[PDB]
Short mmCIF file of C-alpha atoms in Angstrom, two decimals:
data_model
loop_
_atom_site.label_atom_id
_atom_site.label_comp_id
_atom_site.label_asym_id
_atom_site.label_seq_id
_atom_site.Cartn_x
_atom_site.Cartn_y
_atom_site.Cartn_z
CA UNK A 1 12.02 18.05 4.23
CA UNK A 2 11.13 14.33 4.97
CA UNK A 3 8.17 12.67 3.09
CA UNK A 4 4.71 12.87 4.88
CA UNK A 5 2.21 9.78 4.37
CA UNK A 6 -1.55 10.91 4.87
CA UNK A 7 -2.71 7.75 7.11
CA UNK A 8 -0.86 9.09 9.48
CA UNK A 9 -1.96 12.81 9.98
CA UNK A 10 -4.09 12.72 13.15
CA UNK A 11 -6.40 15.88 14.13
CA UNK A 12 -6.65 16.39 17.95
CA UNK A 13 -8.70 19.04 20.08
CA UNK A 14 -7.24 19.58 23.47
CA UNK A 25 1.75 19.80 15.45
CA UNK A 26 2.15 19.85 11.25
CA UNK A 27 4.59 22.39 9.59
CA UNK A 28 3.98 24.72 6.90
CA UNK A 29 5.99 23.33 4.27
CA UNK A 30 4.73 19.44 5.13
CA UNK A 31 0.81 20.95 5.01
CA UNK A 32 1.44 22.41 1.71
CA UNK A 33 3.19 19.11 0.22
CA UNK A 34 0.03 16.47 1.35
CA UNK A 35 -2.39 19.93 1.30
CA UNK A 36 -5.62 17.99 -0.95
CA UNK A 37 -5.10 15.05 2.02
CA UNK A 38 -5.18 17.25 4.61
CA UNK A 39 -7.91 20.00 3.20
CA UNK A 40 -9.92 16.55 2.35
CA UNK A 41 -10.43 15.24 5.96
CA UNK A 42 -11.85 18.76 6.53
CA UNK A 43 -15.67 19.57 6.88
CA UNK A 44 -16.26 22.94 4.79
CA UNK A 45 -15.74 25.84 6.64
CA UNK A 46 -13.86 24.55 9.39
CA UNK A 47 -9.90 25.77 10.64
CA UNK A 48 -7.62 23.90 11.93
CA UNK A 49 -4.30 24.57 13.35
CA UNK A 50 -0.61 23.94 12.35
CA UNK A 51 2.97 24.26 13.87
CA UNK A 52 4.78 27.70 14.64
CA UNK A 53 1.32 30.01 13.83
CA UNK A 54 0.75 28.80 11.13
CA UNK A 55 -3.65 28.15 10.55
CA UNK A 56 -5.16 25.43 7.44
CA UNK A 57 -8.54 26.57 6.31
CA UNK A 58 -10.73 23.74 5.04
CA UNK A 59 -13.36 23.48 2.10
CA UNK A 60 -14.85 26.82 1.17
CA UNK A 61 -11.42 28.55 2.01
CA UNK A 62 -9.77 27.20 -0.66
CA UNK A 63 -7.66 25.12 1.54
CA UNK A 64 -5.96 28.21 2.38
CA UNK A 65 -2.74 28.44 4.67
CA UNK A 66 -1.97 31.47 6.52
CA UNK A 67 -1.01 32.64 9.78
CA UNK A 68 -3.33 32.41 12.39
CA UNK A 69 -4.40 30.36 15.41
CA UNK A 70 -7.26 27.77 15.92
CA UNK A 71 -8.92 25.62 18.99
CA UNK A 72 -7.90 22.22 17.38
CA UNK A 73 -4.44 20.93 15.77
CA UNK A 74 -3.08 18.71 12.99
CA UNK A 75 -0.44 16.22 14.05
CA UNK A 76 1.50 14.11 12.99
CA UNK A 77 3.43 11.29 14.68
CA UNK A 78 6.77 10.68 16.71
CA UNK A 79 8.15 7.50 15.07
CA UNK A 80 5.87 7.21 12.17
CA UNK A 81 6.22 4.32 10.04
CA UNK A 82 6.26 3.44 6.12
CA UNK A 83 3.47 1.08 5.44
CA UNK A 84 5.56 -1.40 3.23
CA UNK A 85 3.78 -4.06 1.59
CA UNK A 86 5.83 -7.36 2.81
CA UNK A 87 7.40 -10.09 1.44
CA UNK A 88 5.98 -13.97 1.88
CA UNK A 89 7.77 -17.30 1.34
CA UNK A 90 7.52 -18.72 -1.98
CA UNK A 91 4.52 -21.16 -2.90
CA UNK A 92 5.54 -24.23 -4.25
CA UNK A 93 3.37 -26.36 -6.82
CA UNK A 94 4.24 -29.51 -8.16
CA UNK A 95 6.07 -30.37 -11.11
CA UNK A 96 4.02 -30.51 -14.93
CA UNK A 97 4.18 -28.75 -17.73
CA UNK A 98 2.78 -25.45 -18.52
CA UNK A 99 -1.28 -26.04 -18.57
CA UNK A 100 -0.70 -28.46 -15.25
CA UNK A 101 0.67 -25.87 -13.66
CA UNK A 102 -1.59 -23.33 -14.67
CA UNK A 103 -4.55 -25.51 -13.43
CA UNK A 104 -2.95 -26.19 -10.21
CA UNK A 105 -2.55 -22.09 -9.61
CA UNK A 106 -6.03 -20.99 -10.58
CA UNK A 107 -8.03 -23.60 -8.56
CA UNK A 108 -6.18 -22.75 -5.19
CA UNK A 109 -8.84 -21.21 -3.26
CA UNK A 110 -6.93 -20.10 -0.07
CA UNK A 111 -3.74 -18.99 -1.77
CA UNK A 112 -5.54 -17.27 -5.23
CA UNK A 113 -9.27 -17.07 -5.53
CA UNK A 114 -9.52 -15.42 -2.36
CA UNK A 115 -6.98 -12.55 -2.50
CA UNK A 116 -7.72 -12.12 -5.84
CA UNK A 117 -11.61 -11.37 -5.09
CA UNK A 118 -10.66 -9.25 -1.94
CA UNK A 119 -8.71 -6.90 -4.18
CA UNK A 120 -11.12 -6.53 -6.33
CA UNK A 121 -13.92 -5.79 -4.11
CA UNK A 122 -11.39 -3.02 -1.88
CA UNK A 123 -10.51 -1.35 -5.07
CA UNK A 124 -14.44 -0.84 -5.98
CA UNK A 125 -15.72 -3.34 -8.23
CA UNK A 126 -19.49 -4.87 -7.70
CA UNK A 127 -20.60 -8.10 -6.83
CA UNK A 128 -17.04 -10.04 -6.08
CA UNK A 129 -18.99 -13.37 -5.43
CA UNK A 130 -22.13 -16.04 -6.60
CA UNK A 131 -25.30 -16.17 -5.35
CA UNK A 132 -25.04 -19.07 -3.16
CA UNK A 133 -23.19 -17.04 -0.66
CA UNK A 134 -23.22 -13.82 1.10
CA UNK A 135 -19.30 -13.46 1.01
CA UNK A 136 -16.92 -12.34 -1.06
CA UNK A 137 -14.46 -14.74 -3.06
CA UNK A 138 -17.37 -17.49 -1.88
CA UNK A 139 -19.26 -19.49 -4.95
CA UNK A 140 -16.64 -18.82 -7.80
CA UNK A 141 -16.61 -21.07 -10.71
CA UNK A 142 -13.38 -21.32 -13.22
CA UNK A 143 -13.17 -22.15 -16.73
CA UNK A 144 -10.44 -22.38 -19.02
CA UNK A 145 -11.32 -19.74 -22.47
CA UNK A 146 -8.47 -19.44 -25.29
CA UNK A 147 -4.70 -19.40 -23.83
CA UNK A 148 -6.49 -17.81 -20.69
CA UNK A 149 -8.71 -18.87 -17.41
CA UNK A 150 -11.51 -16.70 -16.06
CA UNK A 151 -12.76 -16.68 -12.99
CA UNK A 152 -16.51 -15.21 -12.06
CA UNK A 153 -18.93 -15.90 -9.51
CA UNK A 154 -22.08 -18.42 -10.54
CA UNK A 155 -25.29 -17.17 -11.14
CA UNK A 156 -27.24 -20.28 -12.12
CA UNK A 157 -29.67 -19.37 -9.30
CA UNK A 158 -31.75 -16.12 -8.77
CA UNK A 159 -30.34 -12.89 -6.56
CA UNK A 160 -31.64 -9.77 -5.06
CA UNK A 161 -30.15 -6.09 -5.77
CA UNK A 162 -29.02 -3.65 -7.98
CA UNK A 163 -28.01 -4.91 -11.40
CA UNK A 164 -26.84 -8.92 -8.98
CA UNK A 165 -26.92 -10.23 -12.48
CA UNK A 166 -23.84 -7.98 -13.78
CA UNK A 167 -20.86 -10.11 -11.83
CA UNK A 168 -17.01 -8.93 -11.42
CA UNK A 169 -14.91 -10.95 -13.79
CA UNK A 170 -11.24 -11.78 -13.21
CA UNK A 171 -8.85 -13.03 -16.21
CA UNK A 172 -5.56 -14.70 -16.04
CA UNK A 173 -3.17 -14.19 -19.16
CA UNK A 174 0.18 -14.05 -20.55
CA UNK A 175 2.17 -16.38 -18.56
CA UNK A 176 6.23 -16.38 -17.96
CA UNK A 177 9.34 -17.96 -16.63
CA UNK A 178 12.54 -16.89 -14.82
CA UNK A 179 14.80 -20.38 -15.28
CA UNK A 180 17.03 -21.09 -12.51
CA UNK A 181 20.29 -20.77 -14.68
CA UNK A 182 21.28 -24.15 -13.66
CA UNK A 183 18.51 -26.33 -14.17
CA UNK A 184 17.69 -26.13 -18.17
CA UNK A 185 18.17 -29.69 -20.21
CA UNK A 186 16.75 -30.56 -23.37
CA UNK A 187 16.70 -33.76 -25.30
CA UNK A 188 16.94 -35.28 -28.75
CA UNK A 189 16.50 -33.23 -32.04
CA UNK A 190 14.21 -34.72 -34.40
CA UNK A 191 13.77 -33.67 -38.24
CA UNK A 192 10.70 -34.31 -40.44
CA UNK A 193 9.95 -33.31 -43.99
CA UNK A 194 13.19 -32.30 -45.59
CA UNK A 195 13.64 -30.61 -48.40
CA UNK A 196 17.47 -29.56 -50.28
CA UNK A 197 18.34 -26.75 -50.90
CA UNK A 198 21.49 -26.60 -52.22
CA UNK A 199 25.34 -28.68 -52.22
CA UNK A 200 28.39 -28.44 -52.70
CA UNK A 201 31.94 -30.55 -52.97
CA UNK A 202 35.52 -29.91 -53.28
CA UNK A 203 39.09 -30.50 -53.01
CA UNK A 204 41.82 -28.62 -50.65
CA UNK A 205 45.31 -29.24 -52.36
CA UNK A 206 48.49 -29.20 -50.83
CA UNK A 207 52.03 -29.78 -52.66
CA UNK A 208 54.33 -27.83 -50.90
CA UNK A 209 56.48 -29.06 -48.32
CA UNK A 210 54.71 -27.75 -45.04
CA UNK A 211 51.14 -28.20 -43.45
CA UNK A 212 48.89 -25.23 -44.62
CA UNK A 213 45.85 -23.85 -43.32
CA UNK A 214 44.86 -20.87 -45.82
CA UNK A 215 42.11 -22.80 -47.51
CA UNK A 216 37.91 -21.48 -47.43
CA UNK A 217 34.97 -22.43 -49.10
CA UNK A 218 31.84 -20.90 -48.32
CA UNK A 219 28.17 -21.40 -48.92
CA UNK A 220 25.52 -18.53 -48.47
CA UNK A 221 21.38 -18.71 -49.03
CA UNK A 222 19.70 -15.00 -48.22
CA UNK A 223 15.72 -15.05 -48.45
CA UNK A 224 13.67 -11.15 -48.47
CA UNK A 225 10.48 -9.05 -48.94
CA UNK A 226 9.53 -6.01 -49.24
CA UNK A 227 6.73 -3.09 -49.54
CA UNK A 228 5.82 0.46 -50.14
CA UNK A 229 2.89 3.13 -50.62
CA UNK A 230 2.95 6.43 -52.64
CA UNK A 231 0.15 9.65 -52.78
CA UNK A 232 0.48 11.69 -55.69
CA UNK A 233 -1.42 15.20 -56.36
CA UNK A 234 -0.95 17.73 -59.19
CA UNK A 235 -2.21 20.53 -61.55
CA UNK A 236 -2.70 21.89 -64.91
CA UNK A 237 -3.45 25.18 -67.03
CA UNK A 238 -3.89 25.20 -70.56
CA UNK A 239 -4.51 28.08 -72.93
CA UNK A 240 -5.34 27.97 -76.74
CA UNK A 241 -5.90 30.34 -79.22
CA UNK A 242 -7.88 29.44 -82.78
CA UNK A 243 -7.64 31.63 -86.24
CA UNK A 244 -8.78 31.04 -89.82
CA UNK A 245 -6.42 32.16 -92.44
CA UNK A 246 -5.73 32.52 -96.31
CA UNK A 247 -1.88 31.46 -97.25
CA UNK A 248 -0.42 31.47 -100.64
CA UNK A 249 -0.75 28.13 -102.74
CA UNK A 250 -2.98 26.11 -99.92
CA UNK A 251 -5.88 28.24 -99.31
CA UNK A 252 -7.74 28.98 -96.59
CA UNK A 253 -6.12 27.15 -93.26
CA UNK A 254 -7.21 26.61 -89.21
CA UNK A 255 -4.03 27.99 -87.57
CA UNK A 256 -4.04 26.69 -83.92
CA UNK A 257 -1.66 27.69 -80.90
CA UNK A 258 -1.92 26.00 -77.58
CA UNK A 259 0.53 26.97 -74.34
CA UNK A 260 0.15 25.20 -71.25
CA UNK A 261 1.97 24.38 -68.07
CA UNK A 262 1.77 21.60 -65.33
CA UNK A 263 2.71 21.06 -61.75
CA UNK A 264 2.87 17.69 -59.50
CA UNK A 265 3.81 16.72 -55.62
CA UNK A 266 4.47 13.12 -54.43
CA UNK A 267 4.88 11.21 -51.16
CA UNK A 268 6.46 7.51 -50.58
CA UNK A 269 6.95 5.37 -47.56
CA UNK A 270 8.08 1.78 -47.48
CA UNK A 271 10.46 -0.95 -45.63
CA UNK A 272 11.84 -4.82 -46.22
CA UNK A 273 13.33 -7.49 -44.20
CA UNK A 274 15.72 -10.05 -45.18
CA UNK A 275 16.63 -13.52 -43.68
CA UNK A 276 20.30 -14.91 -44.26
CA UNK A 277 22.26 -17.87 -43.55
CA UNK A 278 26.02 -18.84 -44.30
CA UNK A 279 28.05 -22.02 -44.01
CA UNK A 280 31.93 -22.41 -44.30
CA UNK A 281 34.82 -25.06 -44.26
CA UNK A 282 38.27 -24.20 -43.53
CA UNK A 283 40.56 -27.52 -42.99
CA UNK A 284 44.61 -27.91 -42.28
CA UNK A 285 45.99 -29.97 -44.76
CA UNK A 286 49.46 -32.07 -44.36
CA UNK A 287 52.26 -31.40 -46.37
CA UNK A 288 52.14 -33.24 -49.89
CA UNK A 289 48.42 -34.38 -49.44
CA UNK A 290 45.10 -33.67 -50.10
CA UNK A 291 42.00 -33.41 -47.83
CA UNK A 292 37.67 -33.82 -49.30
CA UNK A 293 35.17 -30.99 -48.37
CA UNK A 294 31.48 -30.77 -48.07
CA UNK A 295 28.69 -28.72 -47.43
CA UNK A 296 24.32 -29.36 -47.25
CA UNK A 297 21.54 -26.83 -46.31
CA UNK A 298 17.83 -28.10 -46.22
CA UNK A 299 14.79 -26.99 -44.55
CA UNK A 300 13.27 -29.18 -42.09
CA UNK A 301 10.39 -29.14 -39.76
CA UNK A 302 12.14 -29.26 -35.86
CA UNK A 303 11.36 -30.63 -32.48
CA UNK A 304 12.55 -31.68 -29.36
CA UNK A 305 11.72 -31.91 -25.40
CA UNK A 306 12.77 -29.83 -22.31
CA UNK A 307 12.88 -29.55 -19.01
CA UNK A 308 13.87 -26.60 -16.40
CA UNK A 309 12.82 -25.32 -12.67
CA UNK A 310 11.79 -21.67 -12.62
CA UNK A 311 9.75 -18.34 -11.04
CA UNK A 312 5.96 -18.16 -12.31
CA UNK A 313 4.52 -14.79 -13.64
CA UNK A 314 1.36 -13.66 -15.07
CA UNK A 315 -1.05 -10.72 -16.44
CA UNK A 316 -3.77 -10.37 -13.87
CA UNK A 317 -7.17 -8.52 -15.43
CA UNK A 318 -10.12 -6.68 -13.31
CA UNK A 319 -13.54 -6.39 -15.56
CA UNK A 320 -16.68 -4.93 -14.01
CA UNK A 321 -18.62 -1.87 -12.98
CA UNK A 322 -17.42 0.62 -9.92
CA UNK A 323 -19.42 1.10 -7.18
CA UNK A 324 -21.86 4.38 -6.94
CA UNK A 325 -20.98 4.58 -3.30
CA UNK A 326 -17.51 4.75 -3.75
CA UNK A 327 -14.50 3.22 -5.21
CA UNK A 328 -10.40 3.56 -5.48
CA UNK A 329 -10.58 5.09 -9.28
CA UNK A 330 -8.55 8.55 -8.56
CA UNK A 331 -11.72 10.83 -10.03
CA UNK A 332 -14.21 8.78 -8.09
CA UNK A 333 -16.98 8.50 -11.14
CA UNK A 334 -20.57 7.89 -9.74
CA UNK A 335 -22.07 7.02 -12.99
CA UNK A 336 -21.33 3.21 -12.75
CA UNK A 337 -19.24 2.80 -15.49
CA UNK A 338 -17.47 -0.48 -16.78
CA UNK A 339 -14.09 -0.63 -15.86
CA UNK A 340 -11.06 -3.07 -17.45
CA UNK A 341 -7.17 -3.15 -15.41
CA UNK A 342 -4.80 -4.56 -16.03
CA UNK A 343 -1.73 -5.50 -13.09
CA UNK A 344 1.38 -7.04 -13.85
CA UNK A 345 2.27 -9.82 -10.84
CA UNK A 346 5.89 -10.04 -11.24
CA UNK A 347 9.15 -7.86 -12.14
CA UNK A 348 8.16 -4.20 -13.01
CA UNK A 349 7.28 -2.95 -16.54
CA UNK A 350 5.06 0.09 -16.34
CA UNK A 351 3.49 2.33 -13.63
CA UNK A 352 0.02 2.01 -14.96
CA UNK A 353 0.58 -2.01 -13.81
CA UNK A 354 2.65 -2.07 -11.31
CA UNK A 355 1.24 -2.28 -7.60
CA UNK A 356 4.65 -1.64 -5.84
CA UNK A 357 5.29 1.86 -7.71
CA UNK A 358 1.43 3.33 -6.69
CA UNK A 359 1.81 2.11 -2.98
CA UNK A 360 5.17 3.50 -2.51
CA UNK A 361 4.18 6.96 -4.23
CA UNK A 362 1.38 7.42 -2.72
CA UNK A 363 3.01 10.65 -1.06
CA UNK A 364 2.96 12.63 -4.01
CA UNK A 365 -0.45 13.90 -5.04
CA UNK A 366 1.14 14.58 -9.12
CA UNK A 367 1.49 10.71 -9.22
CA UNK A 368 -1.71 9.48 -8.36
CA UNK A 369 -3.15 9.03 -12.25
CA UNK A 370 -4.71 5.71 -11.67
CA UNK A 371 -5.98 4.01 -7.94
CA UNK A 372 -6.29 6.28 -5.15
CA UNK A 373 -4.57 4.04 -2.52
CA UNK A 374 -4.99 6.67 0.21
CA UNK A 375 -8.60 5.92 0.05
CA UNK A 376 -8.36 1.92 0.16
CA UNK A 377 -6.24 2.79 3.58
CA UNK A 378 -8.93 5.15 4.89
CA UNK A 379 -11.95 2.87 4.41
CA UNK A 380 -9.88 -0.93 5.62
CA UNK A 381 -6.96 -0.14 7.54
CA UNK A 382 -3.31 -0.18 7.27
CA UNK A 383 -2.85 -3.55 8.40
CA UNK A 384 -5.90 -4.85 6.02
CA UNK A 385 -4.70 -3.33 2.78
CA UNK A 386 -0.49 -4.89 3.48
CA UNK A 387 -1.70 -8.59 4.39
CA UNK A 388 -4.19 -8.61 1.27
CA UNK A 389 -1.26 -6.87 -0.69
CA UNK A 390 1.19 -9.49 0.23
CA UNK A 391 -0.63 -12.33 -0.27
CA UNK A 392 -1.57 -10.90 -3.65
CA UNK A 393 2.23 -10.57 -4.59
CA UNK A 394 3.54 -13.88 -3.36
CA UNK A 395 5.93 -15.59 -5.30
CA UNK A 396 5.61 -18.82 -7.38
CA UNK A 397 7.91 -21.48 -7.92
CA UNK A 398 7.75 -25.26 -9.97
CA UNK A 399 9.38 -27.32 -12.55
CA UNK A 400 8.17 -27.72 -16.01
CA UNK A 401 8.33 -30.35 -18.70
CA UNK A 402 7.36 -29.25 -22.03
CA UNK A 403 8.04 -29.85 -26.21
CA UNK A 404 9.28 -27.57 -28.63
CA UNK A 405 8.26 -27.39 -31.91
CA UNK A 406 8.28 -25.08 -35.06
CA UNK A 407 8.02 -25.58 -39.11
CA UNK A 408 10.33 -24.71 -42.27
CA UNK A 409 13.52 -24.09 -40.38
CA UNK A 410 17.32 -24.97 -41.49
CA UNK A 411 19.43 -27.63 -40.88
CA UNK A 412 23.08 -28.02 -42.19
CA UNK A 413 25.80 -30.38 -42.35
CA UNK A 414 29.91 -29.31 -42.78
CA UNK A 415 32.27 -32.12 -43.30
CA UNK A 416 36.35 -32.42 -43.80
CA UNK A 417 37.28 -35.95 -44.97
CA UNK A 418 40.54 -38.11 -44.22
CA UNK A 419 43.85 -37.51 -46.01
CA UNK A 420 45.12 -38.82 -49.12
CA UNK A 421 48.79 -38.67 -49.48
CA UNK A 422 50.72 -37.60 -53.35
CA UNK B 107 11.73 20.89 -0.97
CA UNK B 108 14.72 21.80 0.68
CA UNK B 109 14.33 25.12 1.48
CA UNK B 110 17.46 26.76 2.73
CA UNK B 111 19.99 24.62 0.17
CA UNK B 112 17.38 25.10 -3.05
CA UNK B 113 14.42 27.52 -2.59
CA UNK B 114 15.98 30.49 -1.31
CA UNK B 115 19.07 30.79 -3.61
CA UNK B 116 17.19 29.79 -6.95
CA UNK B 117 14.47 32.37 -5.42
CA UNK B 118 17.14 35.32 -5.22
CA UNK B 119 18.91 34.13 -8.29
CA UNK B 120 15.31 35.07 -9.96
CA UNK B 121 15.16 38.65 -7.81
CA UNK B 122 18.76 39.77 -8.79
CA UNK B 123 18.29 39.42 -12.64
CA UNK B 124 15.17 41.42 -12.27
CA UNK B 125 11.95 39.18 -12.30
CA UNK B 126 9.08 40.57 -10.76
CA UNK B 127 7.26 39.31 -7.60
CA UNK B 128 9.72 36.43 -6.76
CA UNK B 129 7.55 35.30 -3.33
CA UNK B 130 3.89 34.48 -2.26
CA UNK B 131 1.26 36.56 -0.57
CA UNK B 132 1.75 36.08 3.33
CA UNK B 133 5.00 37.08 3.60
CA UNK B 134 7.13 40.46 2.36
CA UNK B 135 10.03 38.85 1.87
CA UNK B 136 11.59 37.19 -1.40
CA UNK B 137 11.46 33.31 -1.63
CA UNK B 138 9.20 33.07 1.33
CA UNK B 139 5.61 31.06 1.14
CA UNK B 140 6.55 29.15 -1.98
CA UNK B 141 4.09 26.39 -2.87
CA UNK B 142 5.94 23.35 -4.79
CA UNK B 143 4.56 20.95 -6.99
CA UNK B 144 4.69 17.81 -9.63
CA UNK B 145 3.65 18.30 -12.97
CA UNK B 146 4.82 15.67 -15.68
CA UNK B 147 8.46 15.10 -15.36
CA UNK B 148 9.47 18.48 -13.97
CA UNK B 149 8.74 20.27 -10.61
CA UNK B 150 6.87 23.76 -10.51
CA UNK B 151 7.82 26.41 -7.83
CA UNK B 152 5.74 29.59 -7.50
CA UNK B 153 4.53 32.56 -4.78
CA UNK B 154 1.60 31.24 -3.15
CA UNK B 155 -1.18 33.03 -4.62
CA UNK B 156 -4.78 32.59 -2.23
CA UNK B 157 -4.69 35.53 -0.50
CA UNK B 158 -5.31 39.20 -1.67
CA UNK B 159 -2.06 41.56 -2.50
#
């Protein structure tokens, strides 16, 4: 009837129903040591491991229960974090080399979820001793191992990557400066006359000017067959003597396949003017192409692709099949709006009732081992917002640039 | 998982047009012990099926 979360089943041995068992049953069968039976609400018995898991009436010497006033386990919101005003790399920077407020959150997740050796080797913490460089369009953050360390595979460190960066603009707040031109080529002109000798103003004049640009492709598989039969004689005819009479019959089939696709680029100018009664009004039109650039500035909400690289623990980790192989692993979480389930933090905590759903971390399992309370602070701080202003330049090659003009007046 | 507003009629929806063995194993009675579950975008609901019958 009502959702049951697992962290809050508690066994006692001085009351669960049937139909909330059954929903949660691989949580509940889990906490179980094999062949032990525990009780449930209205007769009802829950056999452990070995069982099956199986639920059937019954009675037992110890119950499962489940609380009066239970309670969600929302991950909560923080203030905003503020960082002062750059452009895009500044900012960047400014994020990635906040210990408190990043590099330690960051690490802790990494380390709850499974991964080995969150840290350097000039500390015995985790998150301590990180260095950060700056590779491609991306930062990475590992911990240093200049020195020497002591365990299995030390030298094989937890990597995490920062990527794919993006703005929400305050709608209010976007300005942009002058737009410059370099490197101008024509493309093509034209001028005209709109005539007017009648005796009111008119307006039904046009002249238009229209430049379209396009490619294209394709690819085509062809197959086919062919029988031939042919028949020689040797004969004597009248006049011509002996002749080679030859008859040959054959026949032929073929099968093709084609795919393909284009795109086309267009752009259109026009010039409509009123002209006064007995008078007569100039027209033109230009199109070039032109490099383009100009600056901008806006305030906005900072969001990023946030990468985990590294092996899983052989004594356990979060991954929903629990390997013990120690494979390499590679996640990817998106910190910001929602886009997928695979990424998205919120959607796996809040499902976490629903054993169909769980296809990626086992957040159950992070609960069990650290506590409620642990796993929502390191949650929160993990999903905090981020706010500041950015300055920046715009620039891009061979695009258009136009010019429509109506003239003054000349009276007849 | 609502039991008396969707388990029950579907269940004897199933019974009256003559499908066989519309219920689970520990209990005699049609569209009683019913296991639900999640499986890709739909929901599954079958007769419990552990025990012996």
């Amino acid at each position: 009837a009502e959702p049951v979360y697992p962290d809050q089943l508690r066994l006692f041995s001085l009351p669960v129903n049937r139909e909330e068992a059954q929903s949660v049953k691989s949580n509940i069968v889990g906490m179980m040591g094999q062949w032990q039976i525990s009780g449930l609400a209205n007769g009802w018995v829950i056999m452990g491991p070995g069982y099956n898991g199986e639920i059937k009436p019954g009675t037992a010497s110890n119950t499962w229960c489940y609380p009066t006033n239970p309670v969600t386990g929302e991950i909560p919101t923080l203030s905003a974090l503020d960082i002062p005003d750059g452009d895009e790399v500044d900012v960047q920077w400014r994020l990635v080399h906040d210990s408190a407020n990043f590099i330690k959150p960051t690490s802790y997740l990494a380390h709850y979820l499974g991964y080995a050796w969150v840290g350097g080797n000039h500390s015995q913490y985790v998150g301590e001793d990180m260095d950060v460089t700056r590779d491609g369009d991306g930062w990475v953050i590992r911990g240093n191992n200049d020195g020497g360390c002591d365990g299995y595979r030390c030298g094989d460190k937890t990597a995490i990557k920062v990527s794919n960066f993006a703005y929400n603009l305050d709608p209010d707040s976007f300005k942009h400066g002058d737009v410059t031109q370099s490197d101008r080529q024509l493309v093509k002109t034209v001028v005209g006359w709109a005539v007017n000798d009648s005796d009111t103003p008119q307006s039904g004049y046009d002249v238009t000017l229209r430049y379209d640009t396009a490619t294209n492709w394709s690819k085509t598989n062809t197959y086919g067959l062919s029988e031939k039969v042919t028949t020689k004689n040797k004969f004597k005819w009248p006049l011509v003597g002996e002749t080679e009479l030859s008859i040959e019959i054959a026949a032929n089939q073929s099968w093709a396949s084609q795919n393909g696709g284009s795109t086309t680029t267009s752009l259109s100018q026009s010039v409509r003017p009123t002209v006064p009664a007995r008078s007569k009004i100039p027209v033109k039109i230009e199109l070039y192409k032109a490099d383009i650039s100009y600056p901008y500035e806006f305030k906005a909400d900072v969001s990023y692709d946030l990468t985990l690289s590294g092996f899983l623990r052989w004594g356990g980790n979060a991954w929903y099949t629990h390997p013990d192989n120690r494979p390499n692993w590679n996640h990817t979480f998106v910190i910001g709006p929602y886009k997928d389930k695979a990424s998205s933090i919120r959607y796996q905590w809040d499902k976490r009732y629903i054993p169909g759903e769980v296809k990626w971390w086992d957040w159950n399992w992070t609960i069990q081992q650290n506590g409620l309370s642990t796993m929502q602070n390191n949650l929160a701080r993990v999903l905090r917002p981020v706010r500041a202003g950015i300055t920046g330049d715009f620039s891009a090659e061979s695009q258009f640039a136009g010019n429509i003009e109506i003239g003054a007046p000349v009276p007849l």
